[PDB]
Design a protein around this ligand. Structure first.
Ligand SMILES: OC[C@H]1O[C@@H](O[C@H]2[C@H](O)[C@@H](O)[C@H](O)O[C@@H]2CO)[C@H](O)[C@@H](O)[C@@H]1O
Ligand SMILES: OC[C@H]1O[C@@H](O[C@H]2[C@H](O)[C@@H](O)[C@H](O)O[C@@H]2CO)[C@H](O)[C@@H](O)[C@@H]1O
Length: 430
């Protein structure tokens, strides 16, 4: 759609840095912007083009909304979207009760200029950073990760969206975003169905799918490293039954892997390692190092100067190592006993493909209304329990209920920072 002229869109800064040698790294005075889903929608006279989680009378069809409406800028990322920056440091406060409402969550992208995004040289390169999720409790997710959203937020490819990257347009992942207000540069208005729980969210028949690289999915109790692969690893527009993931009728009904090949440590049987005071003690800041190599993935940590390894899986049949490999991805699925879309959409090769797609460094905090994040920090799925892969973390089963969790700790926050990138083994000396 068009750009909203009432507000000027502010893009907070955020130094990050290419890393030549493990000591000679140089800083980039980047910036950041938020996804369009958190932005106000309206016709040429204050009246919105959507509202609550219901599209409006000021709007009619997908192809009409793209032209009749426009998106505005946020501005008070502090006072409205709870974001903050300290140079390299950044902060996103879970629950954000601004003057006229209470906004839940945030999602940001790196920016090589206000028009442009920060794409990344994935394969054969590593990503670093540091996080203080020290008070990110069960039910919540502070996520850092890459995905192949086109450099200009889908503006080139789509003529009807003349807003683009500078306002946070064109997002996709392995879930396929049916929740997106707009997709392929049109509106998700025609047939739009608003859920029960989420008064902000609904779901449209048009989701956009692309390759999804989630080195980070975490919390004070558990995490996972997870690559998702697509037939088409790049931005593509799906259509209803031919959509998969979260918002669709069948999860694996698509072009993409929404379950994927995760390393979830506690899921792999090493339950006393990560957490408050634990081996990987999450009550205080620590560093993640993630490399991305052909047919293999790796990730260390560095706490109190000390380089922390990753627990190997207990599970008989399964290979002894953290490293993401086919040996993993293969001897993983009947063992745990889940539907394998990893290789159902083309093994480590399609991901060895996915890897070589230019990516963007996302940054997010949320709360899942659909699994209550049970898939990350507890016994999932609780359709039985007592088997491998069930468990996930030290968290309980009635936790993750967005509301109730949004009521006990609404001031929790993630602190993203020290982001590093470069050739393999070149952001730290380990
Ligand atoms: O609550 C803030 C924001 O929610 C947006 O929907 C989010 C959803 O809550 C989150 O769980 C999911 O990961 O992303 C979707 C949108 O991508 C909603 O679009 C906004 O109106 C609202 O400001
Ligand atoms: O559906 C919840 C959640 O699933 C995440 O992947 C899950 C998968 O759906 C679940 O069935 C399996 O047991 O665990 C994996 C991850 O460990 C998916 O990535 C999320 O987007 C989704 O909300």
């Amino acid at each position: 759609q068009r750009a909203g002229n009432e507000t000027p869109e502010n893009h907070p800064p955020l130094t990050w840095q290419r890393c030549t040698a493990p000591g000679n790294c140089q800083t980039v005075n980047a910036e950041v912007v938020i996804d369009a889903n958190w932005r106000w929608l309206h016709d040429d006279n204050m009246q919105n083009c959507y509202d609550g989680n219901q599209w409006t009378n000021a709007c009619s069809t997908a192809t009409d909304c793209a032209e009749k409406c426009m998106i505005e800028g946020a501005g008070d990322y502090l006072g409205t979207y709870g974001a903050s920056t300290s140079g390299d440091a950044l902060t996103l406060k879970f629950v954000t009760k601004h003057e006229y409402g209470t906004n839940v969550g945030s999602r940001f992208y790196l920016m090589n200029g206000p028009d442009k995004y920060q794409m990344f040289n994935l394969m054969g390169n590593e990503l670093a950073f540091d996080v203080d999720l020290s008070t990110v409790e069960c039910g919540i997710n502070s996520a850092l990760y890459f995905v192949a959203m086109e450099e200009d937020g889908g503006m080139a490819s789509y003529p009807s969206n003349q807003a683009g990257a500078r306002y946070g347009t064109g997002y996709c992942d392995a879930q396929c975003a049916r929740d997106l207000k707009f997709v392929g540069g049109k509106a998700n208005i025609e047939g739009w169905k608003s859920s029960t729980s989420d008064p902000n969210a609904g779901v449209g028949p048009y989701g956009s799918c692309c390759a999804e690289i989630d080195v980070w999915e975490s919390n004070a109790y558990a995490f996972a490293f997870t690559p998702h692969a697509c037939t088409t690893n790049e931005y593509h527009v799906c259509e209803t039954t031919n959509c998969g993931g979260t918002y669709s009728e069948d999860r694996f009904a698509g072009k993409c892997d929404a379950n994927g090949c995760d390393y979830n440590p506690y899921r792999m049987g090493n339950p006393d390692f990560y957490g408050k005071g634990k081996t990987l003690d999450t009550s205080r800041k620590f560093t993640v190092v993630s490399r991305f190599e052909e047919n293999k993935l790796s990730q260390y940590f560095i706490q109190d100067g000390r380089k922390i390894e990753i627990p190997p899986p207990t599970w008989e049949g399964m290979p002894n190592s953290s490293e993401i490999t086919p040996e993993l991805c293969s001897t993983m699925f009947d063992v745990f006993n889940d539907r394998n879309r990893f290789e159902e959409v083309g093994g480590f090769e399609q991901l060895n493909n996915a890897l070589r797609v230019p990516m963007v460094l996302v940054m997010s905090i949320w709360d899942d209304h659909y699994a209550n994040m049970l898939w990350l920090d507890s016994i999932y799925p609780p359709e039985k329990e007592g088997q491998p892969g069930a468990a996930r973390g030290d968290c309980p089963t009635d936790s993750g209920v967005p509301a109730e969790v949004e009521a006990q700790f609404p001031d929790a926050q993630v602190v993203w920072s020290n982001i590093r990138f470069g050739p393999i083994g070149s952001t730290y000396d380990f």
